[PDB]
Amino acid sequence: XXXXXXXXXXXXXXXXXXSLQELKTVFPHGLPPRFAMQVKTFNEACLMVRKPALELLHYLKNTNFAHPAVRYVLYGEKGTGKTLSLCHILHFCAKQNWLILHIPDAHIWVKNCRDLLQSNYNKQRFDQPLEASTWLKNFKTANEHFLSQIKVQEKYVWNKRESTEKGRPLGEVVEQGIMRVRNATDAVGIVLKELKRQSSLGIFHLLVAVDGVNALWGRTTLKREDKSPIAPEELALIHNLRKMVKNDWQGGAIVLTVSQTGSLFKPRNAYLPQELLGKEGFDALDPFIPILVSNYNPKEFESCIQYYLENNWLQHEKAHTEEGKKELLFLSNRNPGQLERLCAYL
Amino acid sequence: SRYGPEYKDPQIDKEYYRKPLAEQTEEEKYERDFKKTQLIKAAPATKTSSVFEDPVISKFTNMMMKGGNKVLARSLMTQTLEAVKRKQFAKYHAASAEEQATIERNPYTIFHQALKNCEPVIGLVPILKGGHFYQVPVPLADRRRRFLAMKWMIAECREKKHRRVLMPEKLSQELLEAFHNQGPVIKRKHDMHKMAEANRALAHYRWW
Amino acid sequence: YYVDWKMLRDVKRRKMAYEYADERLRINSLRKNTILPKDLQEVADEEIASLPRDSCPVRIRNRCVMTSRPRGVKRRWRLSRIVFRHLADHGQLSGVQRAMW
Amino acid sequence: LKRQNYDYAVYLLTVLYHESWKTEEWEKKKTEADMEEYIWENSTSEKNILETLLQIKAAEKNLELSKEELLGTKEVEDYRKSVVSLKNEGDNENTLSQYKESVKRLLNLA
RNA sequence: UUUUCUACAUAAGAAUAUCCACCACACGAAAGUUUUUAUGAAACUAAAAACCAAAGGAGGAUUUAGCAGUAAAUCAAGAA
C-alpha cells in the first residue's frame, strides 16, 4: 500500500510509515504496548489509516481557533483500535507543530498508586509524585521548541527557600518540577493552568489527548489509610486535568477516548460512552462529537493480512491459501487487536 | 467409557472425505465403515479440523496444564510460540544476508525440530535378578519417546528457572537451544545414552 | 409410661417451655432492645435469670419419639435412623423408596 | 383469616390511591437527582449550551445576546430532543446520530 | 511466577525475598492479641474487621488414589 504524509482521503486502508526519531519525539509518552512490540519486531514503524481517523482529522483540518474548545470522543469495542486512531491525530498535529499534551492512560493516575501524598495547599487534595514526574519527563521530550518560547507570567513559590518569578520559559518550570519530585504534581497543574491562560495567544495551538476520560469522573480505587475510599476530586492531578477538558478556552481542540480495559468498577462488555462516563461524565462532558470506531471491513482486513504477508509475520505454511484468511476472519471477527493476538502465535 | 465397544473413533480430517473417487480400497473401507450402522464417537472439543492445529502442539499444551486450566496453558503456549517467533525476528534483523538465508523464523518447524532432536533413542528399565535391580537398555516405541522429550522440556523449565523468569521466555530459550542441541535437555538425553552404554552387557537380561 | 426417664424430663421441659414462654418473649423484648435504658435491661436480666431454667427453650432436646435415641433423629419424622429404616424398609413408610440414580 | 388479608390488601390499594394525589411541602423540595426523567429545564447541558453559544457569539463578533434568541432557535431544540432521547432512552446508535447531527449544527461543522 | 493484589470474568494495571535502613515487605496466620457482632436465661461457640506477620523454600525410610467427563483444580447447595 502507498502513502506519504498523514492526510489523504483515498488512501484509507494504506500503510503509513514513520521514522524512529518521529516515534521518539512525537510519542515520548506511552504508545499502546502491542503496537510498540509490533514496531520493535518489524523495526519499521507502520500504521494503517482508518475511516474514523479520516473523519476526525478532516474535522481538525477545518478548525476555527477563535471558537471555544471542541470536544471529540472515540468509542467502541475492546481492542477495536480506538487508542491508535488518537495517535494518527497526535503525529499529524505534531507535524503541524502544535503543543501536544498527551496522557496515555488516565486510570494509571486513578488506580494502583504506590505513594499517596496529602496536600492542604489545594484544600484537601492528594498527589502522585511518581506519575507527575514520569509524565513531566515525557512532556520535556514531547515538545522542545515551544518550551524555550513560552513566557510564564505569575509569581511561583516551590519552597520557602526557592521561587521562580515571571518571565521564565516553561522548559525551566517543567524541569524544576521533574528535578524535585516532591512538588512535581503542583508543577504539572501549574503547567496546565498557565498553558490554558497562554493558549489565548496565537503562539499556542493546544491538542489535549486524555485516553480513558471516564477515569476523571469515575469511581476511585485508591484509598486513605483510614481504609476510606477517596473521590475522583481528591487528587491534585484529576482536579487539574478536569480543567483541561472544560472548553473555556480558544486555540485548542480536545480529543478524548472512553475505555473499558483500563476502567474500574465498569463491566467488560459496555463499549458505549454514557455508561462508562456515567451521569457525571456525560453531563459534565457537554456537547461533543461522538465518533464510532469499529472493526475492519473486507478491504481493511485483506489489507491487514497483506501487511502481515509482506513482513512474513505469518509463518504458518497454510496461512497462504484462502483457507487461512477465512479462518482468521471467522476467528477474530476481523477485530484489529483480536487479529493481532491471533497472528501472534501463528 | 460411556461408550460401548461398539463406537468407532471419529476421522476428523477434511481432506480424506473431500476427495474419495481415486481410491478403491479406501472407498471400500469407508463404505464398510458407514454401511455397518457403526455408532461413531462424538468428536472431541479440543480437536478441530482447523488448518492451524498440530496434535504435537496439542499434547505439549495439554501436558503443561495444571488443575482445570486449558486457558492458562493455551496462553503460556501462545506466549512461547510468540517469544520464539519474535526472538527469531530479532536474530534475523541483526544478521548478514547469508544467515538471512539460514535462520528459521517458523516457530512450528523449530518446535518439531526441537523435539525430534531431544528424543532419546534407547531407555532403561529396571529388572530384578538375584535380588538386584539392574538398569537395562530397552529399544523404545515412538510415542513413549515423544512423551519423554515433551515431559523433559516441561519438567526442566518448570524446575530450573529463577522466580522472576516467566515460563514462555524460558521455554523459548530451551526450545531454541534444543534446536541447536546445546541445551540441558539433550544433556539429559546424552546421560540417558551414556548410562545406556555402560550397562549394555546386561541387555542379555532382557527377555522380550 | 414414657419409654425412659430421659423422655420424662424432656417432656416436662416441653410443658415448662410452653408455660413461661410469654414471660420469656416479653422480657427478652426489652433485654434485646438498644433504644431502651441499660437500667431496665439489668433488671430485665435478673428477671429472665430468675425464671426456672427448666422453662427455657434451648434446654429442650429432640429425641426419637418411640425409641428415645437422643441423636441421629430425622426432624421431619421425629424418628431415629434405626427405626426409620426399619419402618421404611417394610414399606410401612409412605413414599420412601431406595434411591438409584 | 383470608377475608382479612383480602380487605387489608384492597385497603392498601385504596390508601395508596388516596395518598398518591396529595401533594405536600417536601415534594416541592424534590431533588433533580430524584428524577425518573431528564428534564431539559434547568439542566447542566443547558448551561453548557448557553456558555458554548456565549463563546460562539463572542468569537463571531456578533454582539447579539439573549436567552430567548439562543434557546428559541432550531438547533438548541435538536439538542433538546437529542439529549433527552439520550438520557431517557439510553445508549443507542440512532441516538448518538441525533447527537452528532445536533452538535454538528451547533458547532457549525458539516 | 501456571505466583500475589484490585478491577473483573477468561486481551488489563501494579506487586515480585534482596536492594539496604527499607519509614521493611513478596508469598504464607487458617494461629495468637484487641474490639465488635450472630445466638443464647448463661459465651467457653461461630462469624467479620484491625494488628501481627511465625514455622515453611516441594519434604527420610516408606506409601495413598485414580482408566474419562475420572483424576486434579474451582463453586454452590442440603442434612442435623
Ligand SMILES: Nc1nc2c(ncn2[C@@H]2O[C@H](COP(=O)(O)OP(=O)(O)O)[C@@H](O)[C@H]2O)c(=O)[nH]1
Ligand atoms: N493496522 C492497524 N492496526 C491498528 C490500528 N489501530 C489499532 N491497531 C491495533 O490494535 C491493537 C490495540 O488497539 P487499541 O487502540 O489499544 O484498542 P483498545 O484496547 O480498545 O483501547 C494495537 O496493538 C494495534 O496493533 C490501525 O489504525 N491500523
Ligand SMILES: [Mg+2]
Ligand atoms: Mg485503550
Ligand SMILES: [Mg+2]
Ligand atoms: Mg440443643
Ligand SMILES: [Mg+2]
Ligand atoms: Mg496483566
Ligand SMILES: [Mg+2]
Ligand atoms: Mg488470625
Ligand SMILES: [Mg+2]
Ligand atoms: Mg510479612
Ligand SMILES: [Mg+2]
Ligand atoms: Mg524465611
Ligand SMILES: [Mg+2]
Ligand atoms: Mg509401594
Ligand SMILES: [Mg+2]
Ligand atoms: Mg475430585
